[PDB]
Nucleic acid binder design. Structure first.
Ligand code: FES
Ligand code: K
Ligand code: K
Ligand code: MG
Ligand code: MG
Ligand code: MG
Ligand code: MG
Ligand code: MG
Ligand code: MG
Ligand code: MG
Ligand code: MG
Ligand code: MG
Ligand code: MG
Lengths: 354, 122, 106, 50, 44, 51, 55, 37, 95
RNA sequence: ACCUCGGAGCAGAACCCAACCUCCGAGCAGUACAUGCUAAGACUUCACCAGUCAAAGCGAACACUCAAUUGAUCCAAUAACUUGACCAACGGAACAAGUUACCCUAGGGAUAACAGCGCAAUCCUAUUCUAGAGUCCAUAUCAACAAUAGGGUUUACG
RNA sequence: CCGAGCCUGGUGAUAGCUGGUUGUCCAAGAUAGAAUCUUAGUUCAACUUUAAAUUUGCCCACAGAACCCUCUAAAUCCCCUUGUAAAUUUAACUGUUAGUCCAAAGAGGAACAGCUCUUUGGACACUAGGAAAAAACCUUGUAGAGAGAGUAAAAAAUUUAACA
């Protein structure tokens, strides 16, 4: 009994008549490149992606970011081609390229990277950490306005936060330096939330910083709705991630319902949901920047629970499932003597009635 | 070797000429079956014998009521040559609590709820 | 001669069967089924599950290791555009690695 | 032969009964009888069988 | 499996190869290149 | 058929589950019968006679 | 069935008394291997002392 | 005996009944064509 | 097996079982592997690993050895520093 | 001649599946010298005995190839580790061949010969075919390659 | 009754061999194999029985099980629903395995055998009716009484040559 296939055969298009006059791969790399392309295509048969690939909804994820900038491709391309010719005109660059002694400046590349394709890479990088999945329930936004956040450690060193870099709570004990390029007369809204910092509700998040109606780049002049609170990842609870959200306000917004007392050392008030918060302010507010870092437990976390939070620090531990053992049988055939030890609880001798 | 049988799906596809011959309606299929074994399970394979027991068809010429569902129909299509299948018709409707003691299944496949044992006055 | 009995080799765990770590999935003389995700292969081409979960069989693109010369010489003579496929057996993990539990309140 | 099959007034044919396993007839038939349709018995071919 | 619609997906030998000259084509030609210089003969 | 495969699914799970629980109850209730003291004493009636 | 190889016994040079048997060709000099000695938990030199049998 | 035999092997009675029931029946016209004009 | 001795009229014990087997009071019989000292040079380390292990006899073999030994070998012993002391009783066993 | 082990066909698709069957072999060699020590969970040649895979861990590096390539217990040797049988009748008795019509006992129609019976390769007979012999001429006779039936007298087979 | 006299004793020698194995009634109850100085036997497993414990067992929707190989086979394995009520484990042992024929697939013989050897299924060693009598074909099983009733399978066809 044979069933006809539900779709085209993988090698049905190849013609077997003139097999001798067909170009072959002749190499391993050529076949591998073709093999990868077909592995990313849907098939009517069962595939690895069906059981292991991350399922995604047919609905395209909506965009809630700023509109893309308008750039003339023809004018942009004209300058780039001329610059390449001038670079290739110099014989020193070719000699350095031929002798393998040339190098590129990293700082200049990143400054140009941050303005051209930096927002797009960060959006893809944010999706890997599941920020859009949690903060906006899958809704994405392009971080059009880069956000520069750096923590002052000591008096001369700074710890920048680009995207998910490791930051200790000791470095995050005080409010960091927040800077960004903005026009005069515009209003902004800073936000800092810990996605996994919550101790009771897995879905809810803890609010660490909330500044509203920021006039331009002057962060200090902005309203202090929520006082800064250092991150407090519990010991043995893993690695937590805190995301800096920067919003652009179209009109002045009153945050009376979101106002919190200073200081706010109660986790019930510190509870915060980004989805509901943006849902009631999406009309006049739009995300503009994004930055996040990963935080571990250190000695400074003990200070927060004892001094600030006035509570006992909870300590977690990674617990694995108990080992699987089949149902114990009265006569284990061809089993080693250590079979009984697998089903014995106490390692100390027992005597029963004696 | 002798083995089970895979009946093609086209066999169980009633034609329009069959609906005018057996009185059935494809748009409104009947709800319940009336299965009656009319052949011996002897000299038949063991899997046919087991299905007869599962359907409660031990005693021959003893009508049994089953549901017209694909899983039950799957078992019937295996022993379809040993049983007689008739639809269950309800001229008076489903029996109620007061009509349980007055039911009677006639040979035509209809279940009456008023078995009076009295000649029709008409 | 030729009085040898069968080796009782074949599929030990079919599609959808729940297996534990170390359970033998399939025994084969030659590579009829290839190891997939969380599936190990022994000396005698014996497929055993490396993790506890559900067994799945899929068709995947076969890219041989460059060191394996015999299989590399086979794909290099294929017509351009042709792609080889083989059956792979995978184990989809069912339980997570572990959980974080509260142990004390300091 | 094609005409004989079309105008055959017998409502029962070997092909219909054998394929549908009517009366459990496949217990005394052969797997080849599903394709031979009763026209072949051993090495002998019967042209009169429809 | 053979009964499955995906039967034969793993077949590969039919894609792998296992003289007479017709009236339209030349069957076998030997191009002899004679030269006293070994580099010129190898290069051509 | 009156219903399709999808519609039929799960329409008798409760009844089937309860039916097996009755089998388990009868299977796990197997125990020797109670022994009464009246029955042991009633064997002395074999020697009952008239005065 | 000519005995091409023979079975010899290698004795540890560390004095621990550990020994193991290995197979070597008959027409060959006495082996001097570097095998792991569990007594000292490190690789130690071994020297062939006595032939056990012929394989 | 073998499935294929040189002589006509006798069919099983159930098979023989099946062959007899499933015999070609030529259509019979109501009036013979020769008698009609 | 001698079911009735000629001088005491009681069941005897087959000494072949006693030397080759060990009985735990839980009913299990512990034996060695046949061939754990034979031709070790031609056996792989994995094969030798399971040859020097102590294994349990199945139900049929255990019932056979219970008839070939008397009740003196089924008694509970309390040897001081017994290597198999912890295996004389089952734990968390159901059915 | 054969007795153990492995592959292919029968056995077409999970496993298994027999001979007087249809074919080819195996009783090794080579590279290692952590071919070390331990330990979840499984396979298993239809029992058992044996056989096979194996995560993690310890310790080191930075479960060898091979379808088969094998032998149990006791015993002997050995300080110990380990080693020992074409025990090949290969699940192996520590060590024993012929002959009997001078034969004996217990049984066997599970089993031979004669017979009966089955079967018709062989045997036998008549038609079909008309090539060919018969001076000419298939059919007075005779007859090839074959075909179609019957017979149960031989030789065989069961 | 001399290829080794007779008698007594060991001796109730032993016999995997032959024969026999005593009252009533009811219930469950048949055909995978491996090893064997073994194929007239025995042991283990399979099967079968009783008791006990426990929870799934059987039927089976998709999905899924290989290439060198189109006899591109019939069909299995797995398998939720569903129909149903069994199944597994524990305890205690006995017994059966010198099988037949029919249908089907394929081997050996001769595209012979009531032939031999595997596989699937049925029947038989379990009753009754019908094929003439009838272990194996068909009908049909769960058990009594009746001088009631309805049915199942179930009775062979065929008579042939003129001719310009
Ligand atoms: S009977 Fe009508 S033509 Fe003669
Ligand atoms: K022997
Ligand atoms: K015997
Ligand atoms: Mg074989
Ligand atoms: Mg046959
Ligand atoms: Mg086994
Ligand atoms: Mg033997
Ligand atoms: Mg063996
Ligand atoms: Mg003489
Ligand atoms: Mg005398
Ligand atoms: Mg006697
Ligand atoms: Mg009975
Ligand atoms: Mg022997």
């Amino acid at each position: 009994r044979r069933t006809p296939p539900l779709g085209p055969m993988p090698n049905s298009d190849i013609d077997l008549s003139n097999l001798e006059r067909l170009e072959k791969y002749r190499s391993f790399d050529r076949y591998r490149r073709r093999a990868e392309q077909e592995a990313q295509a849907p098939h009517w048969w069962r595939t690895y992606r069906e059981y292991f690939g991350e399922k995604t909804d047919p609905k395209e994820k909506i965009d809630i970011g700023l509109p893309p900038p308008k750039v003339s491709r023809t004018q942009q391309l004209l300058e780039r081609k001329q610059a390449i010719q001038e670079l290739r005109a110099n014989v020193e660059e070719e000699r350095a390229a031929r002798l393998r002694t040339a190098s590129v400046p990293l700082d200049a590349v990143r400054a140009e990277w941050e303005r051209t394709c930096g927002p797009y890479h960060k959006q893809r990088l944010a999706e890997y950490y599941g920020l859009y999945r949690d903060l906006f329930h899958g809704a994405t936004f392009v971080p059009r306005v880069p956000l520069h956040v750096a923590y002052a450690v000591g008096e001369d060193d700074l710890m920048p936060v680009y995207c998910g870099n490791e930051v200790t709570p000791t470095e995050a004990a005080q409010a960091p330096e927040v800077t960004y390029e903005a026009e005069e007369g515009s209003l902004w809204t800073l936000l800092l939330t810990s996605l996994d910092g919550h101790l009771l509700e897995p879905d809810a998040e803890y609010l660490h910083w909330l500044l509203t109606n920021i006039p331009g780049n002057r962060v200090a002049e902005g309203q202090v709705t929520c006082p800064y609170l250092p991150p407090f990842p519990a010991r043995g609870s893993g690695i937590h991630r805190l995301a800096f959200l920067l919003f652009k306000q179209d009109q002045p917004i009153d945050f009376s319902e979101d106002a919190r007392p200073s200081p706010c050392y109660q986790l019930a008030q510190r509870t915060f949901r980004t989805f509901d918060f943006y849902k009631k302010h999406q009309e006049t507010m739009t995300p503009a920047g994004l930055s996040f870092f990963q935080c571990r437990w250190d000695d400074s976390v003990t200070y927060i629970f004892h001094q600030l939070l006035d509570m006992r620090e909870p300590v977690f531990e990674f617990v694995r499932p108990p080992p699987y053992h089949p149902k114990q049988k009265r006569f284990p055939h061809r089993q080693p003597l250590r079979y009984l030890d697998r089903y014995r609880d106490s390692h100390e001798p027992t005597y029963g009635i004696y | 070797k002798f083995t089970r049988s895979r009946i093609p799906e086209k066999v169980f596809q009633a034609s329009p000429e069959d609906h005018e011959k057996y009185g059935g309606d494809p748009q409104n299929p009947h709800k319940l079956h009336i299965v009656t074994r009319i052949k011996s399970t002897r000299r038949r394979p063991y899997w046919e014998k087991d299905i007869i027991k599962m359907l409660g068809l031990e005693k021959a010429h003893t009508p049994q009521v089953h549901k017209n569902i694909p899983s039950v129909n799957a078992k019937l299509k295996v022993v379809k040559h040993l049983i007689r299948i008739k639809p269950l018709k309800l001229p008076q409707g489903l029996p109620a609590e007061e009509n349980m003691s007055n039911t009677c299944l006639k040979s035509t496949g209809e279940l009456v709820v008023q078995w009076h044992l009295k000649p029709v006055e008409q | 001669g030729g009085k040898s009995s069968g080796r009782r080799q074949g599929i030990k765990k079919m599609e959808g069967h729940y297996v534990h770590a170390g359970n033998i999935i399939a025994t084969q003389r030659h590579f009829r089924w290839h190891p997939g995700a969380h599936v190990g292969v022994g000396k005698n081409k014996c497929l055993y599950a490396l993790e506890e979960g559900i067994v799945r069989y899929t068709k995947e693109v076969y890219v041989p290791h460059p060191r394996n010369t015999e299989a590399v010489d086979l794909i290099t003579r294929l017509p351009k555009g042709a792609v080889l496929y083989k059956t792979f057996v995978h184990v989809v993990p069912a339980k997570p690695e572990g959980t974080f539990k509260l142990v004390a309140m300091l | 032969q094609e005409e004989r099959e079309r105008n055959n007034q017998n409502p029962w044919t070997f092909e219909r009964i054998a394929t549908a396993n009517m009366l459990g007839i496949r217990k005394v038939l052969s797997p080849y009888d599903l394709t031979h349709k009763g026209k072949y018995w051993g090495k002998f071919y019967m042209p009169k069988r429809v | 499996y053979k009964t499955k619609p995906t039967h034969g997906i793993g077949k590969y030998k039919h894609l792998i190869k296992a003289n007479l000259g017709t009236d339209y084509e030349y069957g076998v030609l030997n191009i002899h290149l004679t030269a006293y210089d070994m580099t010129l003969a190898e290069s051509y | 058929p009156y219903m399709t495969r999808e519609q039929e699914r799960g329409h008798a799970a409760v009844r089937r589950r309860e039916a097996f629980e009755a089998i388990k109850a009868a299977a796990t209730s197997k125990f020797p019968p109670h022994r009464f003291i009246a029955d042991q004493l009633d064997h002395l009636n074999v020697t009952k006679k008239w005065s | 069935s000519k005995s091409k190889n023979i079975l010899v016994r290698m004795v540890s040079e560390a004095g621990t008394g550990f020994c193991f048997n290995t197979k070597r060709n008959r027409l060959r000099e006495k082996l001097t291997l570097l095998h792991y000695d569990p007594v000292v938990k490190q690789r130690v030199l071994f020297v062939e002392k006595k032939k056990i049998r012929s394989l | 005996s073998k499935a294929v035999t040189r002589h006509r092997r006798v069919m099983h009675f159930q098979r023989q009944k099946l062959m007899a029931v499933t015999e070609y029946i030529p259509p019979k016209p109501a009036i013979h064509p020769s008698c009609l004009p | 097996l001698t079911y009735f001795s000629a001088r005491k009229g009681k069941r005897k014990t087959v000494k072949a079982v006693i030397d080759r087997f060990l009985r735990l009071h839980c009913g299990l019989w512990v034996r060695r592997k046949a061939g754990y000292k034979k031709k070790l040079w031609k056996k792989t380390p994995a094969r030798k690993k399971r040859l020097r292990e102590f294994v349990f006899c199945n139900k049929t073999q255990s019932k056979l050895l219970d008839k070939m030994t008397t009740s003196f070998w089924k008694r509970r012993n309390w040897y001081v520093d017994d290597p198999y002391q912890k295996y004389h009783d089952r734990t968390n066993l159901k059915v």
